[PDB]
Amino acid sequence: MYTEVRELVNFVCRYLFGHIPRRPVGIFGAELGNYLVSHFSSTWDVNHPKNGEMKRMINTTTSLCFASSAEEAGVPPSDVLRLLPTNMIIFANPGHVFVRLSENGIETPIWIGDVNADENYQSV
Amino acid sequence: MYTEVRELVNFVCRYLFGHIPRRPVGIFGAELGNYLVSHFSSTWDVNHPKNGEMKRMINTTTSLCFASSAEEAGVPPSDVLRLLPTNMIIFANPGHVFVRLSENGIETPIWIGDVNADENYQSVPEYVVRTAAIRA
């Protein structure tokens, strides 16, 4: 769960790095991940990754979570939304984070791993 | 340190995901991560991120860490060789992982953050934490 959410968050933040200063991007990412980890928890079944998949997916054009995380970071939501591609759908299931661009029929695997990877979440 | 290595490793593995099976990719990333930690440790100075920048840079074609990490993971080095971009130069500094095609060229950011992210803590609601814990 934590692993997947982090990879999702960083994917989104990679549109922001270099454009928006480091500290508010960090706060934006933190708040986004907190929203996601709570919004995901109710359906996260590592024994059936696709279960709740469509309940968990977010849209860069219609999900409120991007604007709300931006406000928390003291960043005008228009600044983030200008930098994020439109009509981009992002999925996070146990072991699999990926994004689809319906405008072009392209999918990108953001992360694939063990559904129990949290066992070594930020370990050394 | 470990944050930056993880971001570098995951950058490289995003070329592999879905084209190399899950288990070998995971072992490749672990091995690459270990090599990088060793390779980065003697010059890593969080107070001066650029110090040692050149010594740390890696090249997807000419740096042997990719092939040897493949070998260590049972994956035929050719399988990884073909999936990675040719002659990409990747830098990892405190707070800053990025691609640069030449010393004068643009840095495309891979990750930017606190030089001390390794020591930082991510806020998670108690019930989420208990819920995860109980599931493991």
DSSP calls for chain B: -HHHHHHHHHHHHTTTBTTB-HHHHHHHHHHHHHHHHHHHHTT--TT-TTTTHHHH-EETTT-THHHHHHHTTT--HHHHHHHSPTT-EEEEETTEEEEESSTTS-EEEEEE--TTGGG------HHHHHHHHHH-
Q: Do A2 and B136 touch (CB under 8 A)?
A: no
Place of tokens 């849209």: A59
Could you give the CA distance from residue A23 to residue B107 in angstroms, rounded to a whole number? 19
The coordinates were experimentally obtained by X-ray
> A33 to each of A9, A86, B125, how far by Cα in Å?
6, 20, 11
B74, B31 Cβ separation under 8 angstroms: no
Q: Total structural domains in chain B?
A: 1
- Measured from the Cβ of residue B125, the count of other Cβ atoms closer than 10 Å reads 12
Residue position matching structure tokens 């991560």: B33
- Report helix, strand and coil shares of chain A as percent, to nearest 5: 45, 20, 35
The burial of A8, by beta-carbon neighbours within 10 Å (0-12 exposed, 13-18 middle, 19 or more buried), is given as buried
Determine contact: A118 vs chain B, CB below 8 A: yes
SS3 B1: coil
Listed in sequence order, the DSSP H helices in chain A are 2-13, 22-41, 53-56, 65-72, 77-83
Q: Which of residues 10-39 of A touch B (CB under 8 A)?
A: 10, 14, 17-18, 22, 25-26, 30, 33-34, 37-38
Distance CA(B98)–CA(B92), nearest Å, equals 7
Name the nearest CA neighbour of B113 among B128, B103, B98: B98
- Domain of A5, in residue numbers: 1-124
Instruction: Decide if A83 touches B, using CB distance below 8 A.
Output: no
Q: Write down the residue that tokens 């990750």 correspond to.
A: B111
Instruction: Please give the Cα distance from B44 to B92 (Å, whole number).
Output: 10
Resolution, Å (one decimal): 2.0
Best A17, A39, A40, A108 member to test B by mutation, with max B CBs in 10 Å, is A17
Nearest CA in chain B to A30: B122
* B89 strand-pairing partners: B59
| Three-class secondary structure of residue B110 per DSSP | strand
Closest Cα of chain B to A91: distance in Å? 15
Chain A residues inside the 8 Å CB shell of B10: 7, 111
CB contact under 8 A, A14 and B125: no
Quick one: how many helices (H) and strands (E) in chain A?
A: 5, 4
Which residue on chain A is closest to B22 by alpha carbon?
A113
Interchain CB distance below 8 Å, A112 and B136: no
Read off the amino acid at residue B65: C
With beta carbons less than 8 A apart as the criterion, state whether A19 and A122 touch: no
